[PDB]
Amino acid sequence: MVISRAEIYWADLKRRPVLVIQSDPYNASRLATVIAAVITSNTALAAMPGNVFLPATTTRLPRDSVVNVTAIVTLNKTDLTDRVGEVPASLMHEVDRGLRRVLDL
Amino acid sequence: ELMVISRAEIYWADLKRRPVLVIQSDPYNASRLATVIAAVITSNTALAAMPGNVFLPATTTRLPRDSVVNVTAIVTLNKTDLTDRVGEVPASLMHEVDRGLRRVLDL
C-alpha cells in the first residue's frame, strides 16, 4: 500500500496508532523503514508541550487522541496494516512545529 | 553513569549495545521526560552514501571506529538507558545532521 505523510496507521510497537512523519520521498523510496510519532489515547499527554490533540471526529479513530512528538519510532513499512485516516493540514502544521521544537530543528 | 543528557552528545545504549546521538532538544532533555530521542550511529561507513546520513571520524567522536549517523534510524530511549558517554559531535557535523533530519522528516 501507499505510505504517505500525515496518515495514521495501526502498527505493532502492543498494537497502537502511529502518525507517519517521514517525508514522502523516503516513503516512496526503497527504504524499508518509516519514521512515525506515536498516538496515545491518554489525552493528559496534551499538556506536554509540542504534543497535538486530535479529536475523534478528525481522525476517524474510536476516541480522542494525542500525537506524542516525544515518542518517535522507526517501523518497517510492512508493519503498517490498516490505515485509519489523515491529519488535516492545520493540525499537521502544529505537529511539525512540535517536532521542530523537540528536535531543535 | 549519571552525567548530563545533552544534545549533540554520543552515548552507548541497549537497543544490542550500540552508539546513539542525542537529537532531542535540551529543554526536553532537562525536563522530567523519561524518554530521549536519538539517532543510531553505525560503523558501516557505506551508509554515508545514503543521503542525509553524516560521517563521523573516530578522531572526532572518540568512538572505536569511524561511524555514520543514520538519520533514517531514529529511536526513543529511556534516559536511564544511556550509559557511558562517548563525547560530542561538533557544531558543523551536527548541522549536517540537522539538515538530514529536516529532509527525512519534511521539516
Author numbering:
A (entry chain G): 1 to 13, 23 to 114
B (entry chain A): -1 to 13, 23 to 114
Copied sentences from the primary study:
MazEF is a TA system implicated in the formation of “persisters cells” of M. tb, which contain more than 10 such members. All the MazF toxins from the family are RNases, capable of cleaving various types of RNA including mRNA, tRNA, or rRNA. To better reflect the specificity of MazF-mt3 in M. tb, the so-called MORE RNA-seq was developed, which identified the cleavage sequence as U↓CCUU. Here we report crystal structures of MazF-mt3 in its apo form and in complex with the C-terminal half of MazE-mt3.
We next crystallized and solved the apo structure of MazF-mt3 at 3.3 Å, using the alphafold 2-predicted structure as the search model for the molecular replacement. The space group is P43212, and the unit cell is rather large, with the three dimensions measuring 110.8, 110.8, and 271.2 Å. There are 12 MazF-mt3 monomers present in the asymmetric unit (ASU), assembling into six dimers. Most chains resolved nearly all the residues except for an internal proline-rich loop of a 9-residue length between β1 and β2. The two monomers were closely associated with each other and were also very similar in structure (a 0.4 Å RMSD over 105 Cαs). Each subunit displays a typical MazF fold, featuring a central antiparallel β-sheet composed of six strands. The helices are mostly short, except for the last helix α3, which also forms part of the dimer interface. The formation of the dimer buries a surface area of 2853.8 Å2. Another notable feature is that α3 in MazF-mt3 is rich in Arg (Arg106, Arg109−110), which forms inter-subunit salt bridges or hydrogen bonds. On the other hand, Arg110′ and Val111′ of α3′ form an intersubunit hydrogen bond with Tyr35 and Ser32, respectively. These interactions contribute to the stabilization of the dimer interface of MazF-mt3 and may be protein-specific because the residues involved are not conserved in the homologs.
